[PDB]
């Protein structure tokens, strides 16, 4: 019946995919509270929606910076995919709009913060704790991949912990609807599949590789391939070698060997039996996949709640103006946004 659930999920997705929501709010409808993250690739602010009093994470992209970084098509992918998808462990896009200078994506706010923060502080997660999160990623990728979507940026930085201790996958900046293969060099160095590094055509198998890296990092406290510079990381990744902490269970070690597999004919997720090779692996023997989808499972860790607008689980960033030019920038490039 997962086959039947997914058939229906595709019908729902395709309707929104073929006729996207556009211009569903305005900047003036939100009160700016705090910057929750930045980057060359943009910034995110906590905002309060006046008509509801709801708190949201508003992603703000500078159209001119997007163009300079050659991320126009990628940004159009992000918004078009996010408005069309619907799954418990995906961050929901509530509103999107644009003005003369910027693009806006208003997402649900997860006050628990990023997995990254909690993982670095605590050090590592126990295998059951890691398994609880990995299961949610297995289900999310099953969903996304069925809609012909490749995610391409799995990492702790992009997984928010919600108020029930469950995961929300965020940042769809490299997500792409592709039947067959694609070639863009993108991702985060520690998480890149070897075929990406080697400039081959690649497919959704690169996400299953990334799952291997995440599970490893969650359970070990550090990624399987690290060094001071990206080049040194890429050398390690393509080497064909990986070392596991002595505290890694036999089952974990075996799952990771089949995920972090350079040979695509052997990598789990990519075989004839698809995601069931992963779902039915011994390491997940205790996982009730339906109970996880339904959020019936008790979460191993619940973030300390201090109100809907509390930012204590996020770091402090330098605040920066939201300037809006009186001349429209990049009108044609982002016409469909």
């Amino acid at each position: 019946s997962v086959k039947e659930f997914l058939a229906k999920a595709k019908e729902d997705f395709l309707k929104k995919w073929e006729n996207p929501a556009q211009n569903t709010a305005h900047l003036d409808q939100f009160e700016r509270i705090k910057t929750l993250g930045t980057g060359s690739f943009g910034r995110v602010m906590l905002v309060k929606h006046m008509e509801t009093g709801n708190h949201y994470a508003m992603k703000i992209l500078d159209k001119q910076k997007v163009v300079k970084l050659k991320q126009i098509e990628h940004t159009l992918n992000e918004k078009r995919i996010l408005q069309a998808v619907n799954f418990p462990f995906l961050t929901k896009l509530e509103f999107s709009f644009k003005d003369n200078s910027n693009l806006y994506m208003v997402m649900e706010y997860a006050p628990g913060g990023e997995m990254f923060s909690h993982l670095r502080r605590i050090g590592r997660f126990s295998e059951p704790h890691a398994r609880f999160y990995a299961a949610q990623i297995v289900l999310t990728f099953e969903y996304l991949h069925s809609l012909d979507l490749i995610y391409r940026d799995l990492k702790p930085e992009n997984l928010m912990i919600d108020q029930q201790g469950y995961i929300k996958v965020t940042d769809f900046g490299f997500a792409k609807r592709v039947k067959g293969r694609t070639w863009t060099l993108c991702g985060t160095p520690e998480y890149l599949a070897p075929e990406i590094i080697l400039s081959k055509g690649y497919n959704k198998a690169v996400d299953w590789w990334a799952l291997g890296v995440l599970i490893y990092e969650m359970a070990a406290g550090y990624p399987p391939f690290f060094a001071d510079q990206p080049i040194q990381i890429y050398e390690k990744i393509v080497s064909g070698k990986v070392r596991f902490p002595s505290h890694f269970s036999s089952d974990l070690k075996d799952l990771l060997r089949n995920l972090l597999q350079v040979d695509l004919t052997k990598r789990f997720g990519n075989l004839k039996n698809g995601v069931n090779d992963i779902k039915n692996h011994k390491w997940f023997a205790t996982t009730d996949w339906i109970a996880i989808y339904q959020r019936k499972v008790e979460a191993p860790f619940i973030p300390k709640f201090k109100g809907p607008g509390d930012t204590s689980n996020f770091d402090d960033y330098e605040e920066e103006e939201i300037r809006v030019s009186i001349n429209e920038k990049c009108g044609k490039e982002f016409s469909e946004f």
Binding site: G39, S40, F41, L69, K70, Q71, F116, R120, D153, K155, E157, G173, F174, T184, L185, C186, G187, T188, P189, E190, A220, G221, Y222, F226, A227, D228, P230, R243, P245
Partner: peptide
Amino acid sequence: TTYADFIASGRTGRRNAIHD
């Protein structure tokens, strides 16, 4: 230890995406 090497590394903070 591997942990000690990671913590002494320059990549224990948030990691930026890459591109062409």
